[PDB]
Write a protein that holds these residues in place. Structure first.
Motif, PDB file in Angstrom:
ATOM      1  N   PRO A  13      34.720 -20.792  -9.276  1.00  0.00           N
ATOM      2  CA  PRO A  13      34.887 -22.089  -9.455  1.00  0.00           C
ATOM      3  C   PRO A  13      33.772 -23.190  -8.760  1.00  0.00           C
ATOM      4  O   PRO A  13      33.474 -22.850  -7.506  1.00  0.00           O
ATOM      5  N   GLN A  14      33.082 -24.153  -9.459  1.00  0.00           N
ATOM      6  CA  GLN A  14      32.175 -24.703  -8.992  1.00  0.00           C
ATOM      7  C   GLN A  14      32.410 -26.244  -9.010  1.00  0.00           C
ATOM      8  O   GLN A  14      32.694 -26.763 -10.030  1.00  0.00           O
ATOM      9  N   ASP A  15      31.871 -26.954  -8.082  1.00  0.00           N
ATOM     10  CA  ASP A  15      31.773 -28.415  -7.938  1.00  0.00           C
ATOM     11  C   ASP A  15      30.876 -29.112  -8.814  1.00  0.00           C
ATOM     12  O   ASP A  15      29.570 -28.502  -8.776  1.00  0.00           O
ATOM     13  N   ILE A  62      29.209 -20.128 -12.721  1.00  0.00           N
ATOM     14  CA  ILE A  62      30.636 -20.633 -12.944  1.00  0.00           C
ATOM     15  C   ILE A  62      31.563 -19.425 -13.276  1.00  0.00           C
ATOM     16  O   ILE A  62      32.990 -19.654 -13.410  1.00  0.00           O
TER      17      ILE A  62
END
Ligand code: ATP
Ligand code: ATP
Ligand code: 5BX
Ligand code: 5BX
Ligand code: MG
Ligand code: MG
Lengths: 330, 330
Positions: free
Chosen positions: B49-51, B46
Motif C-alpha cells: 500500500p502506497q500513499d 503498489i
C-alpha cells in the motif's frame, strides 16, 4: 446508460447451445435498451496452449456468431480483448488488491491444481479471474449477463472493486451479476448432470451451432432420458428430459409449462424429434449468416475496428482515473 | 546497440548506497557505449500500500536521483513504467508461460508467505517477478545491470523467454545478467550481514543519499566493526570492515587493495572518519542537483516525457510481434 459487458473465449470453431442460450440470447434481449460491450476475450484463450492459425480464425468466427445470433453492430460494441491495452493495465492494479488465498479458492484452479497441484498450473491459469475483473470494471459496467459458471468469478470482481473503492471512494463501478434461471446451464446430452463445455471429450452430448444440422439432430435423438415415460419439468429428478424441454423452450419462445401440458400423453421419442427439428431450424439461419461473414470479411473487420476504437476511448479513461487515484505520475 | 534495461522502485524519498553503488554507478559506466533504458518502476511499488501524494513525489525524486548520479538524458532513456502500457500487456502473456510452482519458489514470496502464508499475500506480490520479466523483455534487452538480490528474478525472465521462443523461435531476446562483484551488496551499518534495504526498521545502519550529510556521517562513525584492529578485506570474517572499505572504494575510485596497504598501521576509527568524509563529499553534489531538479521541474518533466515516448515506440513493437506470433487478430 445501463452499461453492460460480457465475453466469450475464442477457444473453439463453434459456440454451443450453452453459450448461445445461456449467454448470447440474454445479450440480444438486453442490447436494445442497454449500453452493451460484447468482447471476444482472446487473452483468456492463451491460458491453454493455442494454435496461432486457429486462434485468429476462431476469434473472427466468435464475433461472427455474435452477429449471427442477433447482436446488432448499430446497437452494441463488439471488439477483441487483446486490442485494448487497458484490460491488462487494470488487471495488474487489481491483482495488487486481490488476496492470494482469495484467488486460490477459485474452483477452476482447484480442479487443475488437483492432479498436478504445482506441476501443470501456470500463473495465467491462476490469475485469469483478476483479468476477468478488469475486463468488466474497465467499462464502468453496471450489469454482467453470464451463465451460472461465472458467478464465483464475478463475486471476486465485486469484492476487489469494493476493496479498491474503500481506499479511493467512487473510482470503480461495482457491477451487478445477471444470471438467467431456465437457461442458466444447458447440460450435456450424454451426461445430464454435467455442463455442456467445449472440453467434453466426446462431443456426442455437445451441440455445436455450426456443426452439420443433421448431426446435431442425430445427437438430440441419442439424448439420455429416464424410464418414466412422463414428460414434465423436474431437473433434480429428471435431468435429461428437463434439459431437452429447456432447449426447445429456448430455441422457440414457448414457455416450459405450456410445452409440458401439450406433451401430456406424448413420449420421450416425440420430445426428441420435436427438439431436434426446432434446433435444426435454429442453427440453419445462423450457419448461413456465419458463412457469409466468413466468406466476405470486410464487414466483420470494420465492426471490430469501430468496436476497439470505442472500447479504447472508454477503457483508457478508466485506467487514467485509477492511475490518478493511485498517485502515478501521469 | 548493446541494449540495456534496469529499474528502481519509487518506494522511498531517497535511494541509499546499495542502490547508488550496487546499481546506478554501474549504469553511469554503461550508458555511454550501451543503448540504455532506465525505468522508475512505479507499478511495482503498489504491491505494497502506497500513499498517493508520496508515490507521485517519490517517482519524480527517483528520476531526479538518476540524473544527480550522472545518468545523462542525452545518452539514455529515463521513463516511468506506468506510462507505457506494453509492460502489462507482455506480463499477461508471459504469465501464461510461467509455472505456478516456479513463481512460488521465489524467495521474496516465501518470506511474506511464511508468517501469513495466504493471509497477507496478494496476487501482485506473487506475480511481480513476471512483470519484472516483461519490463526487460519488452525492450529486446541484451543485458540487465542489477545487484545480487535480483539474480533469481532474472533467471525466471530468461527461462520464460526461452520457453516462449521454444514455441515461437526468435521472438524475444534472452538477456544476460550483469551483476558487479565489489558493490554487489552494500550491507547495513548496524548489522553487517544483512542487506541495506529501505525497509530496515531502524535507519541507523542505512545511508540515504538525500539525508542530512552530517547524520549519514554520524551513522558511519557508529558502524559495527570487529575487535582485531587490523584493516583488511575479508567479508566472510570481517563483515563490517569490508563493508566500509567497499563503500570508500566505490565513492572515491581507489581500489580496495591500494586502500588496505595505505591503512597498514591505521585503526578502525580512521577508517570510519575517512569513509564518512568521502561519503559526505559524495552526497553533497547529489543533494544540490536534486534540490534544483525538485525546485524547477519542467526539465525533469520533459526528460520523462521524451523517455516515455521513446519507450512506447520500442515496447509496443515488441508486444505487436508477440501478439502476431500468438495468433491474435491485430
Ligand atoms: N453449459 C453452459 N450453459 C450455459 N451457459 C454457459 C455454458 N457454458 C458456458 N456458458 C456461458 O457462456 C459464456 C462464455 O463462457 P466461455 O467462453 O468460458 O465458454 P465455455 O463453454 O466455458 O468454454 P471453455 O470450455 O473454452 O471455457 C459465459 O457467460 C458462460 O457462463
Ligand atoms: N543493498 C543493496 N546493495 C546493492 N544493490 C542493491 C541493494 N538493494 C537494492 N539494490 C539494487 O538496487 C536496484 C533497485 O532495487 P529496488 O528498487 O528493489 O531497491 P531496494 O533497496 O530493494 O528497495 P525496496 O526495499 O523498496 O525493495 C536493484 O538493481 C537492486 O539489486
Ligand atoms: C479462462 N478465462 C476465462 N474463463 C471464463 O469462463 C472467463 C470468461 C471467458 C470471461 C472473461 N472475461 C469476462 C467478462 C465477462 C464475462 C465473462 C468473462 O474467463
Ligand atoms: C516489488 N517489485 C520488484 N522488486 C524488485 O526488486 C524488482 C525491481 C524493482 C525491478 C522491476 N523491474 C526491473 C527490471 C530490471 C531490474 C530490476 C527490476 O521488482
Ligand atoms: Mg469457461
Ligand atoms: Mg527490492
Amino acid at each position: 446508460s445501463r452499461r453492460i459487458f460480457s465475453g466469450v473465449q475464442p477457444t473453439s470453431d463453434s459456440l454451443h447451445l450453452g453459450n448461445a442460450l445461456g449467454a448470447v440470447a440474454q445479450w440480444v434481449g438486453l442490447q436494445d435498451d442497454h449500453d452493451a460491450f460484447f468482447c471476444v476475450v482472446d487473452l483468456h484463450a492463451i491460458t491453454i496452449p493455442q494454435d496461432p492459425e486457429a486462434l485468429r480464425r476462431r476469434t473472427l468466427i466468435t464475433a461472427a456468431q455474435y452477429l449471427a445470433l442477433g447482436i446488432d453492430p448499430g446497437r452494441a460494441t463488439i471488439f477483441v480483448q487483446s486490442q485494448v491495452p487497458a484490460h491488462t493495465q487494470l488487471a495488474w492494479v487489481l491483482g495488487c488488491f486481490t488476496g492470494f488465498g482469495q484467488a486460490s479458492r477459485m474452483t477452476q484452479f482447484k480442479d487443475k491444481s488437483a492432479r498436478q497441484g504445482s506441476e501443470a498450473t501456470t500463473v495465467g491459469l491462476f490469475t485469469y479471474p483478476v483479468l476477468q475483473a478488469a475486463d468488466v470494471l474497465a467499462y464502468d459496467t453496471e450489469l454482467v449477463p453470464v451463465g451460472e459458471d461465472q458467478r464465483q468469478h464475478l463475486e471476486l470482481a465485486r469484492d476487489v472493486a469494493q476493496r479498491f473503492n474503500s481506499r479511493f471512494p467512487g473510482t470503480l463501478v461495482v457491477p451487478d451479476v445477471l444470471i438467467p434461471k431456465m437457461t442458466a446451464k444447458i447440460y450435456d446430452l450424454q451426461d445430464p448432470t454435467s455442463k455442456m463445455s467445449k472440453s467434453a471429450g466426446t462431443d456426442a452430448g455437445l451441440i455445436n451451432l455450426l456443426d452439420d444440422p443433421a448431426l446435431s439432430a442425430k445427437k438430440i435423438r441419442s439424448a439420455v432420458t429416464d424410464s418414466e415415460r412422463d414428460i414434465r419439468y423436474d431437473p433434480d429428478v429428471k435431468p435429461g428430459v428437463s434439459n431437452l424441454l429447456n432447449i426447445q423452450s429456448a430455441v422457440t419462445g414457448t414457455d416450459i409449462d405450456v410445452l409440458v401440458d401439450g406433451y401430456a400423453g406424448h413420449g420421450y421419442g416425440d420430445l426428441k424429434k420435436d427438439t431436434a427439428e426446432a434446433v435444426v431450424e435454429f442453427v440453419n439461419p445462423i450457419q448461413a449468416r456465419v458463412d457469409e461473414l466468413t466468406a466476405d470479411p470486410a464487414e466483420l473487420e470494420a465492426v471490430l475496428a469501430a468496436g476497439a476504437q470505442r472500447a479504447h476511448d472508454v477503457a483508457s479513461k478508466t485506467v487514467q482515473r485509477v492511475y490518478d487515484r493511485l498517485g502515478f505520475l501521469l
